[PDB]
């Protein structure tokens, strides 16, 4: 078995290998990359996502989210308080202000220490989940707005045509902005490109050990666990590396820098934080190997998780017994 310790793998495709996205995903899996739950892909040196980022300041962040924490430093939840709209140029200035800017630090490890020590005492503002793309239309390789759609994959594999669309999302971050422990909707893959700015640190649990994380989360967030049998679908809970190590949960960590892709694999739990002002783009995708994960994915039916239009068909076709209850949660 390839990669039996489930380490995060890093790949350096040539320009020739960068032509066929599906084939390269299947290659990475042949080498065991999926066992980690996360892989890094460094694009060939000849490749670029677009010519410059000089003209992005007028993009609107309609609903910036202030991420307010409750709990203890290593075990906390976050809620999102909606703020007034602001442009990317306004948000960048805010991120660079004395109140919100990255503190002095020695290296990524010192910054990670300061994040875990101090996150809960501040409420950073995240411009998350903005529909759109920063890839130039002329970029033909690994352009996240030009991927094969998950609806077309389901149709190719299963023969059933379904409604729905699949488009990318932009994330504008600042120091301490945080993504909570989650898997993707319907345990899909994700791909994330860091367009510009400061790094993003990731933590990941191997898919084969995901249920270990779930059992710890039920112990650590006991009211949330009684409220919902899949409460990590709410995307609000954080658990530090120190706490994971104390409870014997297998995980790995890696820092993504500007110009790099990350791929998360089906049922790979992940969480992380931004080091400073940055912009990422991400989208879900599927392969044939995903279908069985989609059929087994947990679902939130308590009403909190509330998701896209396109998840309806995936539930209806892959999980018909769950459909009725899940849809009640969505309505
Ligand atoms: O970058 C973020 O805030 C969160 N991204 C992801 O969870 C992803 O790409 O799967
Ligand atoms: Mg602009
Ligand atoms: Ni994700
Ligand atoms: Zn729920």
**DSSP letter for each residue of 253-319:** EEEE-TT-EEEEPTT-EEEEEESSSEEEEEEEE--GGGHHHHHH-----SSSS---TTHHHHHHHH-
CB 189 less than 6 A from any atom of ligand 1:
no
Q: How far apart are the first and last CA of the chain?
A: 44
Tokens (6 digits) for 192: 């994330």
CB 282 less than 6 A from any atom of ligand 1:
yes
SS (H, E, C) 91-159: HHHHHCCCCCCCCCCCCHHHHHHHHHHHHHHCCCEEEEEEECCCCCCCCCCCCCCCCCCHHHHHHHHHC
CB 192 less than 6 A from any atom of ligand 1:
yes
Phi, psi at 69, each rounded to 5° = -95, 150
Compute the distance between CA of residue 91 and CA of residue 296 in angstroms, rounded to an integer.
40
Near ion ligand 4, which residues have CB within 5 Å?
A: 228, 300, 302, 304
Side-chain-facing half-sphere of 233: CA atoms under 13 Å:
22
Compute the distance between CA of residue 235 and CA of residue 225 in angstroms, rounded to an integer.
13
State how far the alpha carbon of 315 is from the alpha carbons of 162, 210, 255, 264, in Å: 11, 21, 33, 21
Binding site residue list for Zn(2+): 228, 234, 300, 302
- Please list, in sequence order, all residues whose beta carbon lies within 8 angstroms of the beta carbon of residue 9, skipping any fewer than 6 positions away: 3, 28, 31, 32, 33, 36, 39, 40
Nearest to 46 by CA among 13, 73, 76, 70: 13
Tokens (6 digits) for 276: 């400073």
Binding site residue list: 126, 182, 184, 192, 200, 228, 234-235, 270, 300, 302
Compute the distance between CA of residue 78 and CA of residue 271 in angstroms, rounded to an integer.
13
The ligand with the least distance to the CA atom of 130 is 1
- Please list, in sequence order, all residues whose beta carbon lies within 8 angstroms of the beta carbon of residue 217, skipping any fewer than 6 positions away: 181, 225, 231, 232, 237, 239
Tell how far CA 243 is from the center of its chain.
Answer: 21
Domains present along the chain, CATH in parentheses = 1-331 (2.60.120.650)
CB 190 less than 6 A from any atom of ligand 1:
yes
- Bridge-based pairing of strands 65-72 and 60-61 is unpaired
Compute the distance between CA of residue 162 and CA of residue 156 in angstroms, rounded to an integer.
11
State how far the alpha carbon of 165 is from the alpha carbons of 47, 162, 193, 312, in Å: 27, 10, 20, 11
Radius of gyration of the chain (CA): 19
Nearest to 241 by CA among 253, 259, 223: 253
Tokens (6 digits) for 298: 């947990």
Q: Are 35 and 207 in contact (CB under 8 A)?
A: yes
Q: What is the dihedral of CA 273, 267, 78, 306, to 10 degrees?
A: 130
CB 147 less than 6 A from any atom of ligand 1:
no
CB burial of residue 181 (10 Å; 0-12, 13-18, 19+): buried
Ligand 1 atom with the smallest distance to the CA of 182 is: 7
Side-chain-facing half-sphere of 244: CA atoms under 13 Å:
22
Ligand 1 atom with the smallest distance to the CA of 192 is: 9
Q: How many CB atoms lie within 10 A of CB 260?
A: 18
SS (H, E, C) 202-254: EEEECHHHHHHHHHHHHHHCHHHHHHCCCHHHHCCEEECHHHHHHCCCCCEEE
Entry resolution in angstroms? 1.5
Long-range contact set of residues 113-118: C-beta below 8 Å, sequence gap at least 24: 115/176, 115/201, 115/273, 116/73, 116/74, 116/240, 116/241, 116/242, 117/73, 118/73
Side-chain-facing half-sphere of 319: CA atoms under 13 Å:
22
Q: How many whole angstroms from 192 Cα to the centroid of ligand 3?
A: 9
CB 236 less than 6 A from any atom of ligand 1:
no
Compute the distance between CA of residue 195 and CA of residue 48 in angstroms, rounded to an integer.
10
The ligand with the least distance to the CA atom of 201 is 1
Nearest to 86 by CA among 152, 130, 39: 130
CB 310 less than 6 A from any atom of ligand 1:
no
Place of tokens 């007028």: 58
């Amino acid at each position: 078995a390839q990669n039996p310790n489930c380490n995060i793998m890093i790949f350096h495709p040539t320009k020739e290998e960068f032509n066929d996205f599906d084939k390269y995903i299947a290659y990475m899996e042949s080498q065991g990359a999926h066992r980690a739950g996360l892989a890094k892909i460094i694009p060939p040196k000849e490749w670029k996502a677009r010519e410059t980022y000089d003209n992005i300041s007028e993009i609107l962040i309609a609903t910036p989210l202030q991420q307010v924490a409750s709990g203890r430093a290593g075990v906390f939840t976050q809620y999102h308080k909606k703020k007034k709209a602001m442009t990317v140029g306004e948000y960048r200035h805010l991120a660079n202000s004395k109140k919100y800017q990255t503190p002095p630090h020695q290296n990524f490890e010192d910054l990670e220490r300061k994040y875990w020590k101090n996150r809960i005492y501040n409420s950073p503002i995240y411009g998350a989940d903005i529909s759109g793309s920063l890839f130039d239309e002329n970029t033909k390789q690994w352009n996240l707005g030009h991927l094969g759609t998950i609806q077309d994959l389901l149709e190719k594999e299963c023969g059933v045509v379904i409604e729905g669309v699949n488009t990318p999302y932009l994330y504008f971050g600042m120091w301490k902005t945080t993504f909570a422990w989650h898997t993707e909707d319907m345990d899909l893959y994700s791909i994330n490109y860091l367009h510009l700015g400061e790094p993003k640190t990731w933590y990941v649990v191997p898919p084969e050990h995901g249920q270990r994380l779930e059992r710890l989360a039920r112990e650590l967030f006991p009211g949330s666990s009684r409220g919902c049998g899949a409460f990590l679908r709410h995307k609000v809970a954080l658990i530090s590396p120190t706490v994971l190590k104390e409870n014997g949960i297998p995980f790995n960590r890696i820092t993504q820098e500007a110009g790099e892709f990350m791929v998360t694999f089906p049922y790979g739990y992940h969480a992380g934080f931004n080091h400073g002002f940055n912009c990422a783009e991400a989208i879900n995708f599927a392969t044939p190997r995903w279908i069985d994960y989609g059929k087994m994915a947990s679902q939130c039916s308590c009403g909190e998780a509330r998701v896209t239009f396109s998840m309806d068909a995936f539930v209806r076709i892959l999980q018909p017994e769950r459909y009725d209850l899940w849809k009640r949660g969505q309505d």
